[PDB]
Design a protein around this motif. Structure first.
Motif, PDB file in Angstrom:
ATOM      1  N   UNK A  16     -14.601   2.073 -26.835  1.00  0.00           N
ATOM      2  CA  UNK A  16     -13.225   1.699 -26.549  1.00  0.00           C
ATOM      3  C   UNK A  16     -12.298   2.704 -27.211  1.00  0.00           C
ATOM      4  N   UNK A  17     -11.510   3.427 -26.426  1.00  0.00           N
ATOM      5  CA  UNK A  17     -10.649   4.419 -27.036  1.00  0.00           C
ATOM      6  C   UNK A  17      -9.572   3.831 -27.941  1.00  0.00           C
ATOM      7  N   UNK A  18      -9.156   4.630 -28.911  1.00  0.00           N
ATOM      8  CA  UNK A  18      -8.104   4.206 -29.809  1.00  0.00           C
ATOM      9  C   UNK A  18      -6.806   3.983 -29.041  1.00  0.00           C
ATOM     10  N   UNK A  19      -6.597   4.732 -27.959  1.00  0.00           N
ATOM     11  CA  UNK A  19      -5.393   4.554 -27.155  1.00  0.00           C
ATOM     12  C   UNK A  19      -5.427   3.177 -26.503  1.00  0.00           C
ATOM     13  N   UNK A  20      -6.615   2.730 -26.093  1.00  0.00           N
ATOM     14  CA  UNK A  20      -6.726   1.412 -25.478  1.00  0.00           C
ATOM     15  C   UNK A  20      -6.539   0.306 -26.509  1.00  0.00           C
ATOM     16  N   UNK A  59     -16.428   6.514 -34.589  1.00  0.00           N
ATOM     17  CA  UNK A  59     -15.424   7.076 -33.690  1.00  0.00           C
ATOM     18  C   UNK A  59     -16.086   8.208 -32.892  1.00  0.00           C
ATOM     19  N   UNK A  60     -16.327   8.011 -31.600  1.00  0.00           N
ATOM     20  CA  UNK A  60     -16.948   9.046 -30.778  1.00  0.00           C
ATOM     21  C   UNK A  60     -15.861   9.625 -29.877  1.00  0.00           C
ATOM     22  N   UNK A  61     -16.115  10.775 -29.227  1.00  0.00           N
ATOM     23  CA  UNK A  61     -15.072  11.348 -28.367  1.00  0.00           C
ATOM     24  C   UNK A  61     -14.552  10.417 -27.282  1.00  0.00           C
ATOM     25  N   UNK A  62     -15.399   9.525 -26.796  1.00  0.00           N
ATOM     26  CA  UNK A  62     -14.968   8.605 -25.749  1.00  0.00           C
ATOM     27  C   UNK A  62     -14.446   7.268 -26.287  1.00  0.00           C
ATOM     28  N   UNK A  63     -14.408   7.121 -27.608  1.00  0.00           N
ATOM     29  CA  UNK A  63     -13.896   5.883 -28.179  1.00  0.00           C
ATOM     30  C   UNK A  63     -14.691   5.336 -29.340  1.00  0.00           C
TER      31      UNK A  63
END
Ligand SMILES: [K+]
Ligand code: NI
Length: 172
Positions: free
Chosen positions: A23-27, A55-59
């Motif tokens: 789940x991205x931080x933006x989400x 924290x991975x590149x995709x979330x």
């Protein structure tokens, strides 16, 4: 506000655990109505408390399946109380990953348990009762360790409270 933040932290944990994908931080920021930076700080805080978040590149990733937090618990009981102990943990929301017990030859031995539901507990016990080897929990006066995982600290705390009530816990 302390309460507003406790509520947001609980929501982050739930959202990350429910999600099969990162789940991205933006989400998380959009979903919780706070800035991206607030999320970065919340996540760092959650990790310092014990949450296994990455924290991975995709979330952000946090294993669902009752594996958010982990902890070593020192307990003492006979092999016949195994069922009672496991049921106490799974019925309270957690899972038992393994067991570490001292051994007179190998220092200590680590065995795998891996049960997170009543059915898995029953399969483990049944499986154990059908086997014919020497019990391990007879070693070291019944003193051993378990790595216990739970969805969150609140749940982990409930598990420790229950284990204490059943007199399993070692405390000093
Ligand atoms: K997850
Ligand atoms: Ni045990």
């Amino acid at each position: 506000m302390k309460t507003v933040r406790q509520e947001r932290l609980k929501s982050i944990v739930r959202i990350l655990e429910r999600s099969k994908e990162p789940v991205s931080g933006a989400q998380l920021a959009e979903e919780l109505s706070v800035s991206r930076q607030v999320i970065v700080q919340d996540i760092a805080y959650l990790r310092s408390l014990g949450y296994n978040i990455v924290a991975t590149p995709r979330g952000y990733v946090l294993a669902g399946g009752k594996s958010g937090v982990s902890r070593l618990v020192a307990v003492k009981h006979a092999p016949e109380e195994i069922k009672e102990e496991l049921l106490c943990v799974v019925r309270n929301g957690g899972r038992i990953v393994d067991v570490i017990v001292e051994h007179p030859v190998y220092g200590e031995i680590r065995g795998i348990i891996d049960v997170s539901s009543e059915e898995e507990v029953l399969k483990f016990v049944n499986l154990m009762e059908m086997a014919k080897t020497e019990p391990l929990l007879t070693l070291s006066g019944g003193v051993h360790l378990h790595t216990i995982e739970a969805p969150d600290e609140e749940t982990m705390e409930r598990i420790m409270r229950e284990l204490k009530k059943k007199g399993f816990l070692i405390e000093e």
